[PDB]
Design a binder for this molecule. Structure first.
Ligand SMILES: Nc1nc2c(ncn2[C@@H]2O[C@H](COP(=O)(O)OP(=O)(O)O)[C@@H](OP(=O)(O)OP(=O)(O)O)[C@H]2O)c(=O)[nH]1
Ligand SMILES: Nc1nc2c(ncn2[C@@H]2O[C@H](COP(=O)(O)OP(=O)(O)O)[C@@H](OP(=O)(O)OP(=O)(O)O)[C@H]2O)c(=O)[nH]1
Lengths: 711, 711, 239
């Protein structure tokens, strides 16, 4: 934070010379001094440089051209306004939030003015920093405790060791010194929710629209379990999204509960859709309780909102309709929903309290905001028993939390506060929409096939576009209306190969091939299905990254159409098996994999495998207890009908749980087995395109086994 | 790592001028040159500066004076040896580990030699760095993945925000870029135990004497639960140290198990002693199983080794005697035991496999080695079902681990490896012993009272000194021999106030007053009891911190004997309650508090409180289930006899569990209540010396309540 | 390969100052920075100077005027394109072979951008160098074999002799160190057609429109005899 802008040629030495003097005085204080040419140049400087922390200008010349524009960008940004005898305040300024200091033009005043600017810069810094992080930085600057844990004592133990010195030097002093413990009494305590930690939690709850917020330092994996353990006593029944993260399987394995699954929909691409509205109705649930051994009325429900591919629920509908006293939205993918009105009514915290219910979001701050790995938040709307909730929190929280992770969780909130926060989120939405429109444009303009974007036929509006039953784009048959919405920032691209019907085209380019090409060019694909690719247009992704991705896609098409050798176009793939890929061309690879997909009927098998559930013979908890007693064995995948599965089976595609521990494939659920067998067969053909089923094990002879409970 | 030492005046220009040329060439490559005066000056430079990464010298003049001494300090340290025509290799060098390059004295060769030195320095760095940390640092320098989580994208996202830029600037680019995910495929995966992660685990197991080691990123709080949950299925019985960390109480609250408690001893100071040898013998356990409802033969045993105050067990005895197939040493306080022979036979991993048993250590690498907060290791000796063990591991491990914490765990191993590592731990043992001897010396030399050290009458040997039944220093009655040992690095200081009999002295200085004094001077007291203070002489604590502590203790005596005003001697205490402390002097404070301890009979009540056990009415798991159903209420502490406790009650002193959830104080265990009532009374008198009982709540009228289950 | 061209007057400090900063950061990495007046000046600079290895320019201002013309001269030439908020890719670029990195105008970003340019320059060099030559140059920079023929050992033996030192100094270190033998096993072998030598032969064959190519080190005088002796056994007739 050291860049000061000076805006001006004034034509009078009595103004210009004191400004030259101020330039020199500011440089002596280690500011860097920048000179925009005009009003628009200055606004671009502010917009492009977060470290620009002050603006010097002639008041009469510029106030009516600058003040309103600046206030929209940054409420808090120091203005250093130089006054004329008759300078005054226009009524248009009355309601603007501005930080203004007024100065005179005088020779010899520069040193004093520079000192005031320095002081006002520190006040700005202290205004924008949140409380715990501010306290942590101050401690690192000023503090001096010894005989403390961490045993490394601000990195001291590292410096006495050759390898330790490399480690210390890599991370640097501030990182090492900020790794502290509750011995630093002035920072309070995470587990006690005291001092600056209490201030951080209250600060976060305000920013994120929660009644109460908890900082978790072991990821949403852990936040999910804290919420679940508080919410679901032994002997109870819970409703759980079949599209649930593995941490919720772990919760079920650790807690003696009976699950009843919400059943999401899916399209022909293998993309998950929303749990239909009928799944939330009392009659539906009551009947499933009746049909489930040992089930009672659910005390807790867990819903994944949004889906991975960006489908958000009408959460107003869910909260009004779902007659369960505790509703937890696993919101790991959507930590930013409070920061744009486009997400209103589409996130757990939206709106107010619900009578007789507590609502939660868990969020992975590190995924789609800016925070260190393992940073997570629990947001609560409604009443909890605070002591009992804290026991559950403490059961999963270390006694030695990492303060960097904690500070980063609080600073993520600070970043999202106000106009600078709204602008960060708006910008990610705008850039996602810009890129979405570019794909559609290039699809029209290019010669022959192109990528498509999975979205409405027109996106002339900035909103989470509703999925409507009268539109074919989303692929979900007979969808509920006013139920699901597409998050603009979750951009799904489609490769040729499937028709509007959900039927197969003659020409196809399996998305795995495009992903391989992108990885050559350092672009990671978050998620891939047979003909789909997901890109997260997060606040991380700037215009430069968006352009690089767009250019890589036009280059894929250009190179594909030239039919380059695999050896040249996909060197990393070639290196996996040069002899196999020596003479193969890209169009041949695409054709062959596509024909495999078609021949094996993969999309239809994948649809049918997930449309029926395996039978719950025992709960995940009960199955794991069996495993703990050594009562598992391996059988060939082919032999698993009528056996109780020990491990979750999670195939890619489509990357969601297929079989839970304690479930059995029966005749009712035979397509589960056939899908798994097909994945094993199709994966045996192309090096680099191997079968990937978590819970299935390739044997030396190329058959797969799975782990089942002993009879 | 950029300091190169040149050792010499040779008296011939043909040698001196090329070395002048090399000095310049090396400065151009950004090395610092240093010029020791002689052999001993060079060795001190190496001893004091881990970043000294090369030594240049005339081979004939120095090799017989340097090579052996250097090899004893650093096996790997590059030597750049300048040879004469007749230079040869002495037979004494044959078995030394040395890294030597031979060079000639020639004008114009310096640029080439300097380039070879640069290359050799990089090889040295690559030799000493462990595999995962090396890969991480290399990725940071060279990698270029975009469209990646963490969403901050090497800190990118922070730089677009004013407050974010401050956070980025504080931690720095390396810290930000090293926060990565499994998208960086060349680093493999923690959860899959693959690539450099697998290399890290094997490297660690080798360094720490384990068959298998796991890196945990949520502290030993979590490592304890991973081991416990693998080891103790629902319905089972476990043997658990009554001196158990809260994480083990949480384990019992989360797992449907029945505890039987090992019963530690204690002394009149309130310092915990070891579980007696009789507690481990078959007939003792069999009888307890018979007397405990629902108990069966224990499948798993948990022992805290060492105690907080440094008492280590004869673990050879435990392993031979304890007829339980799974024995877990919670070794959070002693992660360094594999690095000095003084700990052989006194730690979990010591020795070889135990037939028919699996042995664990869990260790908080961040407490007494050098690693980031939350870094923990599980060490296994014996067979586990690797796949079931991994499920329990994954159940408590995030899907987005913090790679800094992971790299710090592996680097802690790299630091402890070999001669560098033996020297580090030897150093800390030597310093602890030096300081112990200094207290004994000052006690003799000083005028009137002084501190004492809780240790044997003679410590003229470097070992973990055995506690003997024929010695009275440790205060334990009828102790088993060849059973408990005192770790040199855990230094307990005693303040005046108790006689050798365990009776009270007329003159006392409660240790709490000394702790408040030390805290004024930025010295943290790890643990305090009525008349004891614990200091950890970790590899953090250098000679400078040891002298600062010794001086602070002499200053405490000096200022105490002058009888300074509390206002002047303890200003932070004074500003607690200025009006209360306005005229009080230090000796009066010490006297008054000591008289209170004496009047209330605190040591006798504390001893008796912990010698009986509350009655286990239900297991902690069953008690927590009741709390989860809302079935708790608050009663006054005075009315708790015959009530089932909902919370753990943990009083300070002596800082170990007194009552577990599910336990009830009866007439048989009334001393528990008497002790707690006394702590409440004694704590009402002096601001800053308040009652501290976890599980008891001070009401506005000064009465205390506890949480119990509803009748 | 160390000349970088910057093309421009933009009229806004928010763009010009970051480019000034980038100038300085690049000179610190030992690049030389040239400033063409306009599009045609830049194209002449590229045409006349093979060691011009990168071009920095404002994307919007120049992409439609530069990208096709550059792709006609050099497929592989690094372009460092500075983007505006609304910068996009014209359909006319689709089939051009371009190497483009996109950057933002920001104060204090120059050190990072200059390092990325350095990296891209090394990637460009490694793209255009063929496999054996690239391996040879890397060995000279990095290798350390001893007890090696040629007996001169990277020119070492020459430096011990007054006349030898003159010979070494004339040809220079790279020439002397690149005179190696099959002892440098990572370069494979000409006679075995192995390793980078096999890659060189296949590279050559493709460039020259051959099924197979052989590298001969004793002139076409010798290449003629190799072909001839394989082709014409004793007692045969040749045209
Ligand atoms: N403190 C302060 N606030 C002002 C001022 N002028 C406008 N505001 C706005 O008012 C908010 C404080 O509103 P209050 O009514 O005082 O607080 P409350 O909403 O928590 O009850 C600030 O929100 P915020 O918490 O700063 O964050 P955000 O909502 O702007 O992101 C800020 O947006 C001012 O002069 N001082
Ligand atoms: N690589 C290598 N090792 C040598 C050499 N000379 C002695 N050593 C020592 O030998 C150890 C390796 O012993 P091995 O028999 O190869 O491996 P093992 O102990 O794992 O079976 C090294 O231990 P370490 O794992 O490096 O650590 P530490 O035991 O010294 O702490 C090091 O102490 C050598 O020339 N090269």
């Amino acid at each position: 934070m050291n860049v000061i802008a000076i805006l001006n040629h004034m034509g009078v030495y009595f103004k210009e010379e004191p400004i030259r003097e101020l330039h020199r005085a500011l440089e002596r204080l280690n500011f860097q001094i920048v000179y925009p040419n005009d009003r628009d140049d200055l606004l671009k400087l502010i917009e492009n440089n977060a470290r620009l922390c002050g603006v010097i200008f002639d008041w009469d010349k510029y106030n009516l051209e600058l003040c309103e524009e600046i206030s929209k960008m940054n409420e808090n940004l120091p203005l250093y306004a130089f006054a004329n005898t008759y300078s005054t305040l226009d009524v248009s300024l009355n309601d603007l939030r501005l930080q203004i200091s007024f100065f005179e033009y005088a020779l010899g005043a520069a040193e004093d003015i520079a000192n005031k600017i320095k002081q006002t810069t520190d006040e700005y810094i202290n205004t924008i920093l949140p409380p715990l992080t501010k306290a942590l930085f101050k401690y690192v600057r000023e503090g001096k405790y010894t005989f403390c844990t961490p045993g490394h004592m601000g990195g001291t133990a590292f410096q006495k060791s050759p390898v330790g010195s490399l480690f210390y030097d890599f991370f640097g002093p501030n990182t090492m010194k900020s790794d502290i413990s509750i011995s630093v009494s002035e920072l309070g305590s995470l587990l006690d929710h005291s001092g600056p930690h209490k201030e951080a939690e209250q600060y976060i709850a305000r920013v994120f629209n929660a009644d109460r917020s908890y900082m978790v330092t072991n990821g949403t994996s852990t936040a999910n379990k804290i919420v679940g353990m508080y919410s679901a006593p032994a002997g109870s029944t819970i409703l759980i999204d079949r599209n649930c993260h593995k941490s919720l399987t772990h919760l079920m394995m650790m807690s003696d509960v009976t699950p009843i699954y919400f059943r999401p929909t899916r399209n022909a691409y293998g993309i998950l859709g929303g749990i239909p509205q009928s799944e939330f109705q009392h009659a539906t649930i009551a009947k499933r309780v009746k049909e489930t051994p040992n089930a009672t009325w659910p005390v807790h429900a867990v819903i994944t909102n949004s889906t991975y591919d960006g489908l958000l629920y009408n959460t107003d509908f869910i909260k009004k309709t779902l007659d369960v006293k505790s509703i937890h939205f696993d919101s790991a993918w959507v930590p930013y929903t409070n920061f744009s009105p486009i997400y209103e009514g589409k996130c757990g915290m939206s709106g107010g309290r619900v009578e007789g219910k507590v609502i939660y979001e868990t969020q992975s701050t590190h995924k789609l905001l800016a925070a260190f790995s393992q940073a997570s938040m629990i947001h609560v709307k409604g009443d909890v028993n605070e002591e009992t909730f804290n026991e559950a929190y403490m059961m999963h929280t270390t006694t030695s939390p990492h303060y960097g992770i904690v500070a980063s969780t609080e600073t993520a909130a600070a970043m999202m506060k106000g106009n600078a926060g709204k602008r960060l989120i708006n910008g990610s939405i705008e850039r996602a929409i810009k890129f979405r429109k570019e794909i559609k444009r290039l699809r029209t303009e290019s010669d022959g096939w192109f990528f498509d974007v999975w979205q409405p036929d027109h996106i002339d509006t900035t909103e989470c576009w509703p999925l409507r039953s009268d539109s074919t784009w989303h692929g979900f048959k007979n969808i509920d209306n006013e139920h699901m919405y597409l998050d603009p920032i979750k951009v799904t691209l489609l490769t040729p190969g499937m028709e509007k019907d959900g039927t197969m085209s003659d020409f196809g380019i399996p998305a795995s091939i495009v992903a391989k090409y992108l990885d050559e060019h350092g672009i990671v694909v978050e998620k891939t299905g047979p003909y789909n690719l997901l890109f997260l247009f997060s606040i991380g992704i700037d215009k430069t990254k968006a352009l690089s991705l767009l250019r890589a896609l036009t280059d894929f098409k250009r190179a594909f159409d030239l039919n380059l050798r695999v050896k040249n176009m996909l060197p990393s793939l070639y290196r996996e098996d040069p002899e196999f890929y020596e003479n193969m061309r890209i169009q041949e690879l695409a054709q062959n994999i596509h024909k495999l997909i078609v021949h094996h009927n993969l999309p239809d098998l994948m649809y049918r495998a997930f449309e029926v559930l395996p039978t719950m013979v025992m709960t995940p908890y009960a199955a794991f207890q069996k495993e703990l007693h050594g009562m598992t064995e391996e059988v060939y995948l082919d032999e698993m009908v009528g056996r109780i599965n020990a491990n979750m089976i999670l195939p890619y595609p489509p990357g969601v749980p297929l079989v839970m521990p304690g479930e059995m494939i029966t005749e009712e659920s035979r397509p589960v087995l056939e899908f798994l067998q097909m994945l094993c067969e199709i994966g045996a053909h192309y090096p680099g395109f191997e079968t990937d089923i978590h819970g299935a094990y390739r044997q030396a002879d190329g058959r797969y086994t799975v782990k089942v409970l002993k009879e």
